[PDB]
């Protein structure tokens, strides 16, 4: 039957995950630069992590 | 010194006394740096919320002293102008004129050159209205004055400057001052009226040269 | 002179443009952004990005007074850019040349 | 999902303009996954009306037009996953 | 016992002409013949034409596709 | 999980639909979906101009349907 | 993958470059500003937005006689809920 | 990094260590501009990156020869401990503002270090402070726009 | 299926009223009330935004177009306190 | 945060401006409301008016409000004894 | 013989004009369409009520606001 050949039964994607690029999110963040300390540390010579 | 805000219409017109340069014994080496230091002292007087960050000099010989006298404010932008605006028309109106001339003390007289047009229309078209009024009063004084009152029944309040008109009267007096401006220009600039597009009408009221 | 026309977007673009507010490798484009920010998210001047780097380098930041001046400067920018004409009109209507 | 950015925003004094024009200025207390915004210390100006002080509000999440966050917000450490 | 999708199934088995009427824009109507649709009920239509009823205007459109949650009716 | 609206009481009945924009329609019901889109035989349009417009078999989106009144006795 | 080729490529190509977008919203306020982020619903968190809409003085005369004025307000950081978005537009 | 490693000219260390979570195929040591590079058939997991700054004089400001020479000096040295034999050494000439690297490259690392070195010479704040310190030492300025 | 839809489940066969999205309000006795707030009601008066009154012995209103539903306070004590 | 508001005298604003005040007893995932003791307002709502504080008011009693038409909540007073 | 996502498959890259429910129209080459039929248009000109108010560039048109799509 052509209603099955259409590929019938009206759909409503509520809650169901959608097919493709619909889910596209993108966040532009840039954190503060975590530099290391060299002068007046009291610590041993190589850097801390 | 005419310090005109386009957006807020707050005209800071500083009175410069005759005694500042009647006995000064100086060249323009005092004059340029003196008008620059006094407009900088106006900037130092106002709070930081009311200080500008963009200053436009009409006459090109002032941005170089303004660079020197405003190094306390590197946040501000001092550009020149290709369009010159006739603020000697402010001198020609009797209120500012005899205000300036009768003032025996140099002072920092405030004005709002848009009277209360900011409750009615934009600040852009209020600026275009003000520069239509000022340029049309520059091309002819009393002709533009009697155009500025379409009836002799209208009055301006003593706290206002320009006569209180509403939108219909303002648009009709605006097209009257506009073709007065173009008629004086085409009388002087050798070329007719109808050969100019509205960009050219715009930069003729604005003061640029085509 | 352009109104933001109801049922229309393009007049707002003509308004904002007028107001000037505008080995077998992978095979790809690495869009390197190198950006300096403080904790608030503000894009950082290279002089003060170097100042943050050098505070973290030397381990000794500013004093109290320079931090007072710097913090009060940042909220001066915040109070300025979040915005006496009406007060001038009300003082003129009380009597036109408010001479300072 | 960007609503997860809002539920990290507990105890911030934000204003919210709704679809009815009503501006609600207050400290946000809770967000659902459907942006159901629960607020306290509420100063709500329903538009064409004078503003009313109310101690607690709970906006349904559909009816939010937009938020307005203050100047002092660290979102570069807030929109991370 | 027939369904709505049975009607539009039989109707693009007919390829006759239909007029869709919209959600709340009661003067706006669009005439067309459906070529295809599926379950979100967006419809492509053959040589569609907007008819404004209160002025009776027929602005020609062509091959159209109209979005599903806008229709109120399809009258043959 | 969309259950069909419970309308075999209203099958083959003369109903007056109210539609969204203050609109109205009349006809015989012939079926539905879980989305309450209704298929209608003998559809008379019945606008607010006052003159009654027969069509026949129409399909009505269930989003636009405010109410059914079974004019015939169920 | 297909995050960067869909119709939200207008948003994920504008949040990468941090360029400003113009948004015609539903109540016809126009948001100009830089997308800090967006999602499926276009819940765009925005920085430095000029919100430009139109008014009239609404019969200040009593005779219903005035011309529409362009008003705008600045918002520093906003979270625009994306149902009220009609169109987002990258700048020329 | 040792605090005196930035001017530890004779020898070196590593600055960045990339861990792959896989094993990279990596290449033979080629310059930052060597667009045609052949694959070294070793496979590595950790990949060091050195940052050698220099102040070139007129004779020896070839940053490509300097990066190549410092890489093949320091990887084949006894007094410079690297985590892996595979890695890259980016040399930056501050007196001439030049940059090139010479060491091994995993996929995508060569365009990334290319564009990252470009943006890092255009926009680094410590480089900027060096540049305007040179400009204030030379009393040489540009005309303001 | 939460507690208000269980309340309108417990309002079946009772006197109930529904104000609709357009503003019409419908005072009658319910027959069926589903998950999605669809209501088939009976013996019912229709009050338009005109203020007029009409009556008919049955109606079936769609759930999303319901603005609200006047319930009887037979259900106010039973059974929702533990909520 | 709404279970911290059960059985209160809640002021629920609809999207038409038809305000309710009543017993916030039951809510739903769609915020479908069940309100006992609830009365309706359109024009004037009380902050101790110069004329009278409660006109434009109707009795309804107990309502199921659909969450589609609902905007906000506020408690106006403490719950009664009963 | 032609269903809607094959149709929008058929016109990614040709000039079309998509009409909003709010009466606006948008002419241009559309780029892409998702599952919800949000639209990305390039080279757009916005026709308010049959008269254009401006060339605009690249626009995203949200799916909840389109009324139809017309192939010109």
Provide the 10 A C-beta neighbour count for residue G30.
Answer: 25
The structure tokens listed for K33 are 């369409």
Between chains, do C37 and D73 touch, taking CB under 8 Å as contact? no
Strands D12-18 and B110-112: unpaired
Strands B77-80 and E28-37: unpaired
Provide the 10 A C-beta neighbour count for residue G66.
Answer: 18
Under DSSP, the state recorded for B60 is G
Among B147, B140, B151, which residue's Cα sits nearest to residue B181? B140
Residue appearing with tokens 């091959």 = E63
Taking phi first (over 0 means left), then psi (-120 to 50 degrees means alpha), and beta for anything else, what does residue H74 get? alpha
Provide the 10 A C-beta neighbour count for residue F29.
Answer: 22
Among H116, B160, F12, which residue's Cα sits nearest to residue C35? H116
> Hey, which residues 37-56 in chain J have their CB within 8 Å of chain I?
none
Handedness of CA B188, B193, B196, B199 (dihedral sign): positive
What's the angle, vertex CA I48, arms to CA I43 and CA I54, rounded to 5?
35
Please report, for residues B136, F12, G89, J73, the alpha-carbon distance to residue D15 in angstroms, rounded to integers and kept in the order given. 48, 54, 26, 16
> What resolution (Å)?
2.9
DSSP notation for J1-30: --GGGTTEEEEEEETTS-EEEEEEEE--TT
The structure tokens listed for C83 are 């915005």
Contacts of A26 in chain G (CB under 8 A): 3, 11-12, 15-16, 37-38
Distance from CA of A20 to the nearest CA of G (A): 7
Between chains, do G22 and C16 touch, taking CB under 8 Å as contact? yes
Please report, for residues A28, E48, G12, G86, the alpha-carbon distance to residue G39 in angstroms, rounded to integers and kept in the order given. 12, 35, 9, 15
**Strand-pair partners of K42:** K29, K58
The structure tokens listed for H99 are 């940059």
Residue G64 contacts B, CB cutoff 8 Å: no
Contacts of I67 in chain J (CB under 8 A): 14, 16, 65-66, 69
The structure tokens listed for K27 are 């002419």
Chain A residue at shortest CA distance from C59: A37
Strands G69-80 and F65-70: unpaired
Residue I78 phi, psi (nearest 5)? -125, 130
| Counts for chain F of helices (H) and strands (E), in that order | 0, 5
Chain F residue at shortest CA distance from I1: F1
Residue appearing with tokens 């949650």 = E69
Residue I21 contacts F, CB cutoff 8 Å: yes
Of F23, F43, F64, the CB nearest to E75: F43
Cα–Cα distance between K50 and E57 in angstroms, integer?
Answer: 14
Cα–Cα distance between F62 and F47 in angstroms, integer?
Answer: 19
The b/e string for B82-106 (b: 16+ C-beta within 10 A; e otherwise) is eeebbbebbebbeebeebbeebeee
Residue I55 contacts F, CB cutoff 8 Å: no
Among K40, E3, D71, F4, which residue's Cα sits nearest to residue G76? D71
Sheet-wide strand order for H39-54:
H16-27, H39-54, H87-93, H98-101
Experimental method: cryo-EM
Between chains, do K36 and A21 touch, taking CB under 8 Å as contact? no
For chains K and E, having 3+ Cβ pairs within 8 Å is answered yes
Residue appearing with tokens 């889910």 = A23
Among B65, B38, B52, which residue's Cα sits nearest to residue B10? B52
What's the angle, vertex CA B208, arms to CA B203 and CA C3, rounded to 5?
30
Cα–Cα distance between F14 and B97 in angstroms, integer?
Answer: 86
Residue appearing with tokens 């599903």 = E68
Task: Report which secondary-structure segment, H or E, holds B167.
Answer: helix B167-188
Residue G63 contacts B, CB cutoff 8 Å: no
| C29: three-class secondary structure by DSSP | coil
For chains I and J, having 3+ Cβ pairs within 8 Å is answered yes
Under DSSP, the state recorded for A48 is P
Distance from CA of C21 to the nearest CA of K (A): 15
The structure tokens listed for K2 are 């032609």
Among C52, C68, C72, which residue's Cα sits nearest to residue C60? C52
Cα–Cα distance between C17 and B84 in angstroms, integer?
Answer: 23
Counting every residue, how long is chain D? Answer: 81
Among J40, J30, J29, which residue's Cα sits nearest to residue J63? J40
Among K69, F36, F45, which residue's Cα sits nearest to residue E30? K69
The structure tokens listed for D38 are 């629960």
**Strand-pair partners of E57:** E52
Of E1, E4, E72, the CB nearest to F33: E4
What is the Cβ-side half-sphere exposure of residue J51, based on CA atoms within 13 angstroms? Answer: 4
Are the beta carbons of J35 and J20 closer than 8 angstroms?
yes
Cα–Cα distance between F19 and F31 in angstroms, integer?
Answer: 17
Helix axes B141-148, B167-188, angle to 10 degrees: 160
**Strand-pair partners of I20:** I66
Between chains, do D71 and C41 touch, taking CB under 8 Å as contact? no
- Reported in sequence order, the residue ranges of E38-70 that DSSP labels E, i.e. its strands, are 43-52, 57-66
**Chains near K (3 or more Cβ pairs under 8 Å):** A, C, E, G
| K26: three-class secondary structure by DSSP | strand
Chain C residue at shortest CA distance from A47: C57
The structure tokens listed for B55 are 């200053």
Cα–Cα distance between C79 and B48 in angstroms, integer?
Answer: 9
How many angstroms separate the most distant Cα atoms in chain C? 84
Cα–Cα distance between B35 and B29 in angstroms, integer?
Answer: 11
Chain H residue at shortest CA distance from A41: H3
Helix axes B124-139, B198-205, angle to 10 degrees: 70
Helix axes H109-123, H125-138, angle to 10 degrees: 40
Cα–Cα distance between J46 and J24 in angstroms, integer?
Answer: 20
Cα–Cα distance between K7 and E46 in angstroms, integer?
Answer: 12
Contacts of C29 in chain H (CB under 8 A): 111
Q: What is the CA radius of gyration of chain G?
A: 16
Between chains, do K35 and A6 touch, taking CB under 8 Å as contact? no
Chain C residue at shortest CA distance from A41: C59
| Whether residue I79 has a cis bond before it, omega within 30° of 0 | yes
Cα–Cα distance between G76 and H115 in angstroms, integer?
Answer: 32
Residue appearing with tokens 């907007």 = E50
Cα–Cα distance between K65 and F27 in angstroms, integer?
Answer: 31
Range(s) of the domain holding residue I20: 1-83
Between chains, do I62 and F67 touch, taking CB under 8 Å as contact? yes
| B94: three-class secondary structure by DSSP | helix
Strands B77-80 and B54-57: parallel
Among E11, E5, E3, E4, which residue's Cα sits nearest to residue E46? E11
Are the beta carbons of C32 and H115 closer than 8 angstroms?
yes
Cα–Cα distance between C66 and C87 in angstroms, integer?
Answer: 35
Residue A3 phi, psi (nearest 5)? -70, -25
Using H for helix, E for strand and C for coil, what is the string for H3-22? CCCCCCCCCCCCCEEEEEEE
Contacts of A45 in chain H (CB under 8 A): 2-3
Among J67, F68, J63, which residue's Cα sits nearest to residue I40? F68
Residue F74 contacts A, CB cutoff 8 Å: no
Chain J residue at shortest CA distance from I72: J62
DSSP notation for D5-71: HHHT--SEEEEEEETT--EEEEEEEE--TT--EEEEEEEEE-TTS--EEEEEEEE-GGGEEEEEE-S
Provide the 10 A C-beta neighbour count for residue J61.
Answer: 16
Helix axes H125-138, C46-58, angle to 10 degrees: 110
Distance from CA of F55 to the nearest CA of I (A): 23
Between chains, do J63 and I68 touch, taking CB under 8 Å as contact? yes
What CATH number labels E3-76? 2.30.30.100
Are the beta carbons of H56 and H66 closer than 8 angstroms?
yes
Return the CATH number of D1-81, one of 3.30.420.40, 3.90.850.10, 1.10.10.10, 2.30.30.100: 2.30.30.100
Cα–Cα distance between I71 and J25 in angstroms, integer?
Answer: 14
Task: Report which secondary-structure segment, H or E, holds F54.
Answer: strand F54-60
Of E2, E25, E69, the CB nearest to F39: E2
**Strand-pair partners of E49:** E31, E60
Task: Report which secondary-structure segment, H or E, holds K33.
Answer: strand K24-33
Under DSSP, the state recorded for A18 is P
Please report, for residues A41, B200, B201, I1, J41, the alpha-carbon distance to residue B207 in angstroms, rounded to integers and kept in the order given. 65, 10, 10, 73, 60
**Chains near D (3 or more Cβ pairs under 8 Å):** A, C, G, J
**Chains near B (3 or more Cβ pairs under 8 Å):** C, G
Q: Which residues neighbour E7 within 8 Å (Cβ) at sequence distance 6 or greater?
A: F39, F57, F59
Between chains, do D79 and A25 touch, taking CB under 8 Å as contact? no
Under DSSP, the state recorded for I62 is -
Alpha helices in H10-90 (DSSP H): 63-74
Cα–Cα distance between C48 and B59 in angstroms, integer?
Answer: 36
Strands E57-66 and J57-65: unpaired
Residue C42 phi, psi (nearest 5)? -70, 140
- Reported in sequence order, the residue ranges of chain H that DSSP labels E, i.e. its strands, are 16-27, 39-54, 87-93, 98-101
Provide the 10 A C-beta neighbour count for residue B194.
Answer: 7
K20-23 — which CB contacts under 8 Å span 24+ positions? K20/G86, K20/K61, K20/K65, K20/K66, K20/K67, K21/E22, K21/E23, K21/E25, K21/E70, K21/K65, K21/K66, K21/K67, K22/C7, K22/G86, K22/K65, K23/C7, K23/K48, K23/K49
What CATH number labels F8-70? 2.30.30.100
Residue H81 contacts A, CB cutoff 8 Å: no
Provide the 10 A C-beta neighbour count for residue C33.
Answer: 12
CATH number at K38 reads 2.30.30.100
Distance from CA of G81 to the nearest CA of C (A): 19
Chain A residue at shortest CA distance from G34: A28
Among B43, B41, B78, which residue's Cα sits nearest to residue B61? B78
Structural domains of chain K, count: 1
For chains I and C, having 3+ Cβ pairs within 8 Å is answered no
Residue A30 contacts G, CB cutoff 8 Å: no
Under DSSP, the state recorded for B198 is H
Q: Which residues neighbour B13 within 8 Å (Cβ) at sequence distance 6 or greater?
A: B1, B2, B3, B90, B96, B100, B109, B110, B111
Of C4, C22, C82, the CB nearest to G74: C82
Cα–Cα distance between H56 and C80 in angstroms, integer?
Answer: 47
CATH number at G70 reads 2.30.30.100
The structure tokens listed for H32 are 């930052």
How many residue contacts between D and J have a Cβ separation below 8 Å?
A: 43
Contacts of K35 in chain A (CB under 8 A): 13, 18-20, 22
Residue H125 contacts A, CB cutoff 8 Å: no
Cα–Cα distance between K5 and E40 in angstroms, integer?
Answer: 11
């Amino acid at each position: 039957i052509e209603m099955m050949k259409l590929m019938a039964s009206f759909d409503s994607t509520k809650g169901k995950k959608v097919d493709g690029s619909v889910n596209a999110y993108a966040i532009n963040v840039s954190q503060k630069r975590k530099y290391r300390q060299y002068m007046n540390r009291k610590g041993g010579f190589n850097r801390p992590l | 010194i005419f310090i005109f805000n386009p957006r807020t219409g707050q005209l800071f017109l500083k009175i410069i006394h005759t005694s500042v340069w009647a006995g000064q014994k100086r060249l323009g080496q005092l004059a340029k740096w003196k008008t620059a230091e006094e407009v900088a002292a106006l900037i130092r007087s106002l709070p930081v919320e009311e200080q500008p960050k963009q200053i436009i000099v009409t006459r090109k010989g002032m941005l170089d002293p303004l660079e020197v006298h405003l190094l306390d404010f590197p946040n501000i932008v001092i550009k020149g102008s290709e369009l010159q605006l006739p603020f000697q028309a402010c001198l020609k109106v009797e209120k500012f004129g005899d205000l300036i001339l009768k003032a025996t003390e140099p002072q920092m007289v405030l004005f709002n050159l848009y009277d209360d047009w900011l409750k009615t229309i934009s600040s852009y078209t209020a600026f275009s209205r003000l520069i239509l009024i000022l340029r049309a009063l520059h091309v002819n004084n009393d002709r533009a004055k009697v155009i500025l009152k379409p009836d002799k029944t209208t009055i301006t309040e003593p706290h206002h400057i320009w006569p209180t008109l509403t939108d219909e009267e303002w648009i009709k007096v605006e097209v009257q001052l506009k073709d007065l401006i173009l008629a004086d220009y085409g009388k002087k600039n050798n070329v007719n009226v109808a050969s100019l597009t509205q960009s050219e009408i715009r930069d003729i009221i604005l003061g640029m040269e085509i | 002179e352009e109104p933001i026309v109801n049922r229309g977007l393009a007049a707002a673009l003509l308004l904002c443009q007028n107001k000037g507010l505008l080995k077998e490798k992978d095979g790809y484009k690495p869009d390197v952004k190198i950006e300096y920010v403080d904790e608030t998210g503000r894009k950082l001047t290279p002089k003060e990005a170097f100042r943050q780097l050098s505070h973290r380098f030397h381990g000794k930041g500013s004093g109290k007074m320079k931090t007072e001046r710097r913090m009060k400067k940042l909220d001066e920018e915040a109070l300025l850019k979040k915005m006496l004409g009406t007060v001038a009109l009300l003082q003129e209507k009380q009597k036109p040349y408010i001479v300072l | 999902k960007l609503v997860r950015f809002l539920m990290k925003l507990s105890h911030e004094t934000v204003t919210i303009e709704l679809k009815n024009g009503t501006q609600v200025h207050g400290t946000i207390t809770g967000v659902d996954v459907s942006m159901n915004t629960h607020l306290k210390a509420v100063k709500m100006t329903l538009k064409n009306r004078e503003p009313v002080q109310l101690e607690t509000l709970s906006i349904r999440g559909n009816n939010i037009r937009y938020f307005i966050l203050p100047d002092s917000l660290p979102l570069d450490t807030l929109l991370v996953d | 016992m027939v369904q709505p999708i049975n009607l539009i199934f039989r109707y693009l088995q007919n390829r006759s002409r239909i007029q869709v009427w919209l959600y709340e824009q009661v003067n706006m109507r669009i005439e067309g013949c459906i070529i295809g649709f599926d379950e979100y009920m967006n419809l492509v239509l053959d040589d569609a034409e907007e008819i404004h009823s209160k002025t009776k205007s027929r602005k020609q459109l062509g091959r159209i596709m109209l979005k599903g949650d806008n229709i109120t009716l399809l009258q043959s | 999980k969309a259950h069909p609206p419970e309308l075999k009481k209203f099958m083959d009945k003369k109903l007056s639909l109210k539609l969204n924009g203050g609109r109205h329609v009349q006809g015989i019901l012939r079926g539905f979906d879980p989305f309450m889109n209704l298929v209608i035989d003998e559809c008379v349009e019945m606008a607010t101009s006052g003159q009654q417009n027969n069509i026949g078999m129409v399909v009505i989106r269930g989003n636009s349907i405010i109410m059914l009144e079974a004019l015939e006795r169920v | 993958e297909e995050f960067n080729t869909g119709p939200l490529s207008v948003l994920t190509q504008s949040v990468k470059n941090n360029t400003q977008v113009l948004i015609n919203c539903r109540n016809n306020k126009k948001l100009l500003g830089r997308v800090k982020a967006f999602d499926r619903h276009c819940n765009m968190v925005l920085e430095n937005v000029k919100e430009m809409w139109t008014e009239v003085p609404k019969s200040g005369k009593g005779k219903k006689k005035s011309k529409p004025v362009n008003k705008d307000r600045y918002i520093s950081k906003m979270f625009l809920r994306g149902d009220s978005v009609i169109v987002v537009l990258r700048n020329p | 990094i040792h605090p005196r490693k930035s001017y530890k000219m004779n020898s070196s260390c590593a600055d960045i260590l990339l861990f792959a979570s896989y094993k990279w195929n990596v290449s033979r040591p080629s310059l930052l501009a060597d667009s045609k590079d052949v694959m070294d058939s070793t496979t590595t997991q950790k990949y060091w990156i050195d940052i050698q700054l220099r102040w070139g004089d007129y004779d020896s400001h070839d940053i490509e020869r300097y990066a190549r020479a410092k890489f093949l000096d320091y990887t084949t040295d006894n007094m410079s401990i690297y985590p892996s034999p595979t890695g890259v050494l980016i040399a930056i000439d501050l007196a001439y503002n030049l940059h090139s690297a010479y060491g091994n490259w995993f996929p995508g690392s060569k365009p990334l270090i290319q564009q990252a070195m470009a943006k890092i010479m255009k926009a680094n704040p410590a480089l900027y402070v060096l540049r305007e310190r040179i400009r204030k030492g030379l009393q040489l300025y540009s005309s303001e726009p | 299926i939460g507690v208000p839809i269980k309340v309108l489940h417990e309002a079946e066969g009772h006197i109930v009223t529904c104000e609709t999205n357009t503003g019409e309000v419908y005072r009658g006795k319910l027959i069926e009330a589903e998950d999605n707030m669809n209501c088939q009601m009976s013996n019912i008066t229709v009050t338009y935004r005109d203020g007029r009154v009409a009556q008919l012995e049955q109606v079936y209103i769609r759930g999303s177009k319901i603005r609200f539903l006047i319930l009887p306070d037979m259900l106010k004590n039973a059974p929702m306190l533990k909520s | 945060k709404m279970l911290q508001h059960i059985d209160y005298r809640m002021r629920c604003i609809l999207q038409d401006g038809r305000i309710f005040i009543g017993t916030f007893k039951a809510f739903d995932k769609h915020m479908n409301l069940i309100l006992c003791d609830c009365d309706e307002f359109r024009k004037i709502k009380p902050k101790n008016s110069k004329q009278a504080e409660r006109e434009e008011k109707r009795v309804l009693g107990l309502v199921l409000l659909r969450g589609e038409n609902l905007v906000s909540m506020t408690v106006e007073g403490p719950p009664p004894k009963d | 013989p032609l269903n809607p996502k094959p149709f929008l498959n058929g016109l990614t890259g040709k000039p079309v004009m998509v009409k909003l429910k709010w009466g606006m129209e948008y002419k241009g080459y559309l780029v892409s369409v998702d599952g919800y039929m949000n639209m990305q248009l390039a080279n757009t000109e916005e026709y308010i009520d049959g008269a254009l108010s401006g060339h605009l560039g690249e626009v995203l048109i949200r799916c909840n606001n389109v009324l139809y799509i017309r192939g010109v």
